[PDB]
Amino acid sequence: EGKLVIWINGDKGYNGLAEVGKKFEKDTGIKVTVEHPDKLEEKFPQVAATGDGPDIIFWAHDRFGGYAQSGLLAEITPDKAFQDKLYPFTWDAVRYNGKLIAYPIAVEALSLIYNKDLLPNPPKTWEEIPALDKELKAKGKSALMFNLQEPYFTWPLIAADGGYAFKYENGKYDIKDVGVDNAGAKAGLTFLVDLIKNKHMNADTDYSIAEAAFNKGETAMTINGPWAWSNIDTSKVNYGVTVLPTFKGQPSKPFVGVLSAGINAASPNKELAKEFLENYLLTDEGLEAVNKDKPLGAVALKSYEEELAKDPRIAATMENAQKGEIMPNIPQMSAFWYAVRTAVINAASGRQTVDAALAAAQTNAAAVKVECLEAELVVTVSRDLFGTGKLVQPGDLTLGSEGCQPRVSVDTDVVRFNAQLHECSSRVQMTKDALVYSTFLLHDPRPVSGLSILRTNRVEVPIECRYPRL
Numbered sequence: 001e002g003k004l005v006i007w008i009n010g011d012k013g014y015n016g017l018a019e020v021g022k023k024f025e026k027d028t029g030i031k032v033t034v035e036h037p038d039k040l041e042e043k044f045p046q047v048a049a050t051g052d053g054p055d056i057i058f059w060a061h062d063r064f065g066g067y068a069q070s071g072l073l074a075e076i077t078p079d080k081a082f083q084d085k086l087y088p089f090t091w092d093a094v095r096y097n098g099k100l101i102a103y104p105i106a107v108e109a110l111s112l113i114y115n116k117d118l119l120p121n122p123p124k125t126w127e128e129i130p131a132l133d134k135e136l137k138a139k140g141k142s143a144l145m146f147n148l149q150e151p152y153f154t155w156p157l158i159a160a161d162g163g164y165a166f167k168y169e170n171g172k173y174d175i176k177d178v179g180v181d182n183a184g185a186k187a188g189l190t191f192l193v194d195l196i197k198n199k200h201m202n203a204d205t206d207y208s209i210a211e212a213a214f215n216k217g218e219t220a221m222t223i224n225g226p227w228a229w230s231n232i233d234t235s236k237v238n239y240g241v242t243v244l245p246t247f248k249g250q251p252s253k254p255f256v257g258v259l260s261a262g263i264n265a266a267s268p269n270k271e272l273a274k275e276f277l278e279n280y281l282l283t284d285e286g287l288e289a290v291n292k293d294k295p296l297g298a299v300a301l302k303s304y305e306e307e308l309a310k311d312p313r314i315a316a317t318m319e320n321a322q323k324g325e326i327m328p329n330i331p332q333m334s335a336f337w338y339a340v341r342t343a344v345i346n347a348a349s350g351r352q353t354v355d356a357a358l359a360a361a362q363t364n365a366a367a368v369k370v371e372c373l374e375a376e377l378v379v380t381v382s383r384d385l386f387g388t389g390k391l392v393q394p395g396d397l398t399l400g401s402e403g404c405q406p407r408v409s410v411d412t413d414v415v416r417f418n419a420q421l422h423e424c425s426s427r428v429q430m431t432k433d434a435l436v437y438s439t440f441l442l443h444d445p446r447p448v449s450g451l452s453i454l455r456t457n458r459v460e461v462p463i464e465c466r467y468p469r470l
């Protein structure tokens with residue numbers, strides 16, 4: 001106590017935020033340490049639960065609903081005055097069960113970035129790209145390259161024809177109705193898989209690779225957010241930020257993220273944190289510092305938002321955001337992201353059919369929660385697997401092959417597997433960055449007693465853990 005530790009992703013303007021801390025230390029004498037750990041969104045909950053963790057954590061609003069439910073977040077109490085300074089849309093994003101849990105910072109959205117010396121006219125539709133690629137392939141270039149390793153980037157396409165995360169009905173989200181295995185999704189994803197089959201794109205393409213490609217002018221287009229602009233400005237590439245291409249006449253639907261800053265419920269400096277955020281970061285001078293390092297896009301503060309609205313890049317950001325859908329901040333979000341992530345990855349690698357991959361993503365997102373530990377794996381399965389109300393039995397569930405002998409625990413609503421990674425991995429591989437331990441969870445009620453007909457209750461989902469190669 002007597003300082004502030006802050007966590008924020010590595011792709012954000014952490015250097016600018018540390019400057020806002022440099023000022024905060026000068027005026028109050030309290031030192032601010034800004035950190036940018038990898039997987040900090042998965043790590044925060046882990047440390048915060050043990051009383052530890054940073055004072056302030058930065059991330060899109062979608063994670064904070066889970067945090068608040070786990071009791072890891074202190075409630076924020078800004079007065080009516082301070083509230084008027086921020087847009088009502090941004091406050092809604094950080095509200096869970098009728099409470100304010102974090103401070104809205106900026107509004108993010110994925111935009112289409114093109115290099116106009118290469119491509120004066122950006123494609124208005126996705127379909128135009130397969131052909132536009134052949135033309136560029138002719139002169140040692142590629143049409144499009146972006147991060148295929150994160151569902152955040154490929155979702156805008158999948159969600160175009162009618163893909164959605166959770167059905168919002170009657171004023172609430174139905175965590176059992178997930179729209180990832182419908183025709184709209186399959187369409188979007190199928191198109192993406194085709195691109196990789198057509199070799200118009202590489203399945204192993206991730207953030208840095210797509211960044212370096214576009215920044216070195218090796219590709220005409222890329223998809224990314226405001227934070228990316230800083231590095232593209234330094235590469236002195238004549239680029240442009242425009243609306244995302246439409247898929248089958250329908251516009252791409254990106255998830256709208258609202259960069260938020262929460263306060264650790266176990267943080268001893270709650271008052272100090274409230275000061276820094278309200279009275280140092282959320283001001284014209286504070287947001288300016290960060291924005292300069294890495295663009296925040298459309299800031300939540302009305303005063304500094306209007307000053308940046310002139311920027312055509314921000315305008316295109318807002319346009320895509322307008323055509324997109326705000327992320328739910330419900331705790332089931334993480335399950336959703338994992339489900340989709342695994343889906344896209346398996347499909348793109350041709351390891352699964354689009355129809356199968358999105359089928360498993362359906363179950364995963366609804367019924368399954370995977371937790372990856374150092375040498376250990378935890379899989380939690382909803383007993384109401386199908387949503388029929390008929391609870392499955394533990395003996396019917398099976399993790400991995402015969403060698404996998406996990407410790408099985410059974411609650412009223414769940415069945416939990418604790419498995420050793422070494423014992424339970426059916427498949428291991430290496431990516432640019434990652435070691436991937438993979439396995440499957442299986443529900444096989446058979447042999448059954450009655451005549452199994454219509455819908456089959458044999459379900460198999462992918463269980464995967466990805467670890468950074470250091």
Ligand SMILES: OC[C@H]1O[C@H](O[C@H]2[C@H](O)[C@@H](O)[C@@H](O)O[C@@H]2CO)[C@H](O)[C@@H](O)[C@@H]1O
Nearest residue numbers: 009060062063108150151152153257337
């Ligand atoms: O891809 C899954 C991922 O999506 C979002 O993460 C974004 C984040 O919102 C952006 O600020 C920036 O950091 O890019 C991220 C994707 O690499 C969700 O916020 C996150 O929960 C989810 O895991």
